[PDB]
Design a binder for this molecule. Sequence first.
Ligand SMILES: OC[C@H]1O[C@@H](O[C@H]2[C@H](O)[C@@H](O)[C@H](O)O[C@@H]2CO)[C@H](O)[C@@H](O)[C@H]1O
Ligand SMILES: OC[C@H]1O[C@@H](O[C@H]2[C@H](O)[C@@H](O)[C@H](O)O[C@@H]2CO)[C@H](O)[C@@H](O)[C@H]1O
Ligand SMILES: [Ca+2]
Ligand SMILES: [Ca+2]
Ligand SMILES: [Mn+2]
Ligand SMILES: [Mn+2]
Lengths: 239, 239
Amino acid sequence: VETISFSFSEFEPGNDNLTLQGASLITQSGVLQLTKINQNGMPAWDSTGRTLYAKPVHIWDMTTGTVASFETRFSFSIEQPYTRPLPADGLVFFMGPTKSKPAQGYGYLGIFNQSKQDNSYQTLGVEFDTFSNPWDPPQVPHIGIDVNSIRSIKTQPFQLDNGQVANVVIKYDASSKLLHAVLVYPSSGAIYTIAEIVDVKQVLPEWVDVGLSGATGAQRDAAETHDVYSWSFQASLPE
Amino acid sequence: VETISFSFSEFEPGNDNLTLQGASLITQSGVLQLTKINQNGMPAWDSTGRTLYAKPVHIWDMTTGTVASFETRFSFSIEQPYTRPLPADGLVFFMGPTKSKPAQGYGYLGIFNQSKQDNSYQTLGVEFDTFSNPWDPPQVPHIGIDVNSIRSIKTQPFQLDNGQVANVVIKYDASSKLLHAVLVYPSSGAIYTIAEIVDVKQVLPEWVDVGLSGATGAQRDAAETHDVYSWSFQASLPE
Ligand SMILES: OC[C@H]1O[C@@H](O[C@H]2[C@H](O)[C@@H](O)[C@H](O)O[C@@H]2CO)[C@H](O)[C@@H](O)[C@H]1O
Ligand SMILES: OC[C@H]1O[C@@H](O[C@H]2[C@H](O)[C@@H](O)[C@H](O)O[C@@H]2CO)[C@H](O)[C@@H](O)[C@H]1O
Ligand SMILES: [Ca+2]
Ligand SMILES: [Ca+2]
Ligand SMILES: [Mn+2]
Ligand SMILES: [Mn+2]
């Protein structure tokens, strides 16, 4: 059974277990800022940042056909400081091909290049989308399950509690092929849930890099923060 | 589309929208005590109590083959006051045949009569089991999904935060046939999740009564409270 596990209760500047890409940065206070915050302390527009765990994870084995069960938990906050233009774009927890670089930002969230459903993406993502693009449902923010496309196969609207910490739990049970995610805001006590069937063998490569990506908007000040406070992950391949 | 919905932010003594059975009682303070609390304020052993919503709900239609999607949310607390004997037995959210009466108590939780998997039960339940019976996993307490048997098809251990309020969300998406449940303890911030595939058409009658049932143990003082503070439910049949 090969297992891989990690827990960052806080982020350490300079640690070598995380690959930071784009605007991503760890502050001296221990928080991971996925998108840029300016000198005056406000979120910068046109920013994309990602953080990938530095070891690939063996998610399924073609020789035996077994696939791993996994769980990830993370805490984040989004602060939207201006009434207009509308804030944008959101953050995503994703799994895809190893050694990837950032793709398009804005509504593609640093992981897709257009809005087609293309099997060559080989990407699974759980988004927290704050801007309604032509491919989105009208309600934002929303949690969405993305399978080889920014056009989610399932969406769940949620209300943002501005600048408050949200706790996320995403679990995948390989036997039932069920991906279930929960978002809880301790401040208001709000609980949101989403679940869909996803057979990972049809989507992902055998080895994947796991990460978080965030992006701000395409026009001046269409921005918000995408701060992450802790992140843990565990995966077990019955092999 | 026929919908049925209800929300009790608190329980009103004497309201006629709830059928109370066994030891079940609503206090003047608005809480639903599923099992008996003695004069000295401690939970009584050998007690079984249930509360059913007074209108049946149309869960699936044989003529069109459509099945309803539903969601229920409730808050409860369990207080276990003695170190020995082990506390028992737990509470369950259930759906089954209309006009039912309490079945066996103790580990059967007021809804089964033995530990066989019998299709004539026609019962779906999500339990919060506090005592490990011969049919249980060794870890208690645990959340379990029961389909025509007290022998759960899926189990998830959780740690009890004694006497604290737990918030539960159970959702069923008819399209994917996914039953997903979440338990959150606001006090510790603990989040537990369980999900399994359940095709309701193979289990339930077309019309069901929905309820909550609780039971205490078979020997002196193997007991705990099973207090419910609020309960809401909504179901929609695309018909
Ligand atoms: O406004 C944030 C939002 O912008 C979209 O891009 C717009 C851009 O803002 C606008 O100035 C330009 O004329 O056309 C673009 C076409 O939509 C992004 O696509 C969206 O993701 C957000 O970033
Ligand atoms: O102790 C609570 C526990 O009791 C089980 O029943 C026991 C009973 O306690 C014991 O005194 C008797 O000799 O045998 C019974 C067989 O197990 C219940 O089955 C269980 O659900 C709890 O209620
Ligand atoms: Ca979007
Ligand atoms: Ca039991
Ligand atoms: Mn979206
Ligand atoms: Mn059990």
